[PDB]
Amino acid sequence: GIVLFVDFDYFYAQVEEVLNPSLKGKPVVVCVFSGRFEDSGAVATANYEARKFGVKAGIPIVEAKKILPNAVYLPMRKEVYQQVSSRIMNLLREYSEKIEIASIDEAYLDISDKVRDYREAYNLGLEIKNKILEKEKITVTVGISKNKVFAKIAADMAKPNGIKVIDDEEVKRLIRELDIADVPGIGNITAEKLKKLGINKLVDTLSIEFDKLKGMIGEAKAKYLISLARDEYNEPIRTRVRKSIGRIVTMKRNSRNLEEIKPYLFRAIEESYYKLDKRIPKAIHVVAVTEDLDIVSRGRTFPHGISKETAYSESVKLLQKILEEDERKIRRIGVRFSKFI
DNA sequence: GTTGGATGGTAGG
DNA sequence: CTAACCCTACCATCCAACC
Numbered sequence A: 001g002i003v004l005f006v007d008f009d010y011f012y013a014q015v016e017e018v019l020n021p022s023l024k025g026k027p028v029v030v031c032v033f034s035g036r037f038e039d040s041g042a043v044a045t046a047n048y049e050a051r052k053f054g055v056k057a058g059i060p061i062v063e064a065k066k067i068l069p070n071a072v073y074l075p076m077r078k079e080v081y082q083q084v085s086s087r088i089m090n091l092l093r094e095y096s097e098k099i100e101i102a103s104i105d106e107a108y109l110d111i112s113d114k115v116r117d118y119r120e121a122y123n124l125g126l127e128i129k130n131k132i133l134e135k136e137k138i139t140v141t142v143g144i145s146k147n148k149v150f151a152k153i154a155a156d157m158a159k160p161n162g163i164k165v166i167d168d169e170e171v172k173r174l175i176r177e178l179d180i181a182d183v184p185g186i187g188n189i190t191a192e193k194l195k196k197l198g199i200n201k202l203v204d205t206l207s208i209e210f211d212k213l214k215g216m217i218g219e220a221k222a223k224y225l226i227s228l229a230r231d232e233y234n235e236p237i238r239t240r241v242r243k244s245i246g247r248i249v250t251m252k253r254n255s256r257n258l259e260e261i262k263p264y265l266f267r268a269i270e271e272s273y274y275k276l277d278k279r280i281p282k283a284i285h286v287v288a289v290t291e292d293l294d295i296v297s298r299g300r301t302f303p304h305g306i307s308k309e310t311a312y313s314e315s316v317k318l319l320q321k322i323l324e325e326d327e328r329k330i331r332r333i334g335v336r337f338s339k340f341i
Numbered sequence B: 001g002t003t004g005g006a007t008g009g010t011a012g013g
Numbered sequence C: 001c002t003a004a005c006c007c008t009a010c011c012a013t014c015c016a017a018c019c
């Protein structure tokens, strides 16, 4: 069982460099402008030239411009990166039909029936990389291991423009050596709970009574971690199926006024319904982000599919339901559809 | 004794 | 308006309905 994982390098920015070769070699920052004020919004991603100065996904644009005034700031174009992505995902399809698309820039190929061993996987990996570079002019990073988790880790070690195998040896070693916060799915809240406990390595999780582990991090992560340490984790590559689709936008200024908010919410339903694409949902949720950035939502599930007419009506009720139960003002508003037929 | 809906927490793209 | 966009997956909790 060999899994190969591909993750595109600084994707959004790379696509702009390809689309405009004069940018290449100098700082580039791809932004989501929010409309509230001059240069408001956040960074979606930056090239490595820019990361050298502290500019990464998530920081505010005005922060980016503080520390890197002279870089090139480009509005985000989602449609463009998604067509390049789809073209790339199709190239990958010619190397294994057994493909799991994980996000707009990464995919898992199960390559067992294509290669006899790690050495061949590596070669196939080099072949994938050239293919993509030839057809799309995009560099990527490749991770190869016996499962999804470790293929992901191997890639994280190799970025950017890399390729790395973690063979059955190294898997055994990393279950002992690797800091536990480097396990995909272990973020900041969970790492704290584990270090306060004295779990620093995947291996430590077999040295602790299951219920205390489960008591702290929850059942599912516990099973996840323990499964990973027994070297039994074997969750297969599966064709992903969107479970929800939605959209949320930022308002020019904070509001509580249903009339002032309404057109924002409706924009979101329109876009949302466009992306639905023949999918009928039974569940609608209105999501609202507040002044202090806390996220609040109100929903409903119908025994039956929701039409675009119903969505407009139910969402307005739900918005009011929010305004009713939370007295904070609203800063971003949107909607999320789920539970398809 | 377990669905599952409503809501929120966590993680990561 | 004075920083914090953006989209999705999975899980936990509290709560009800079933039976």
Ligand SMILES: Nc1nc2c(ncn2[C@H]2C[C@H](O)[C@@H](COP(=O)(O)OP(=O)(O)OP(=O)(O)O)O2)c(=O)[nH]1
Residues within 6 Å of the ligand: A007, A008, A009, A010, A011, A012, A013, A032, A043, A044, A045, A046, A057, A058, A104, A105, A159, A160, B013, C005, C006
């Ligand atoms: N709007 C927004 N978009 C993001 C954010 N994080 C990632 N993206 C988008 C932009 C990235 O180019 C793309 C892929 O994200 P990645 O996590 O793989 O990092 P990226 O490819 O940009 O650099 P790479 O070498 O992986 O590290 O997804 C974010 O916080 N906000």
Ligand SMILES: [Ca+2]
Residues within 6 Å of the ligand: A007, A008, A009, A010, A011, A105
């Ligand atoms: Ca990437």
Ligand SMILES: [Ca+2]
Residues within 6 Å of the ligand: A007, A008, A103, A105, A106, B013
């Ligand atoms: Ca990625």
Ligand SMILES: [Ca+2]
Residues within 6 Å of the ligand: A181, A182, A183, A186, A187, A188
């Ligand atoms: Ca981590």
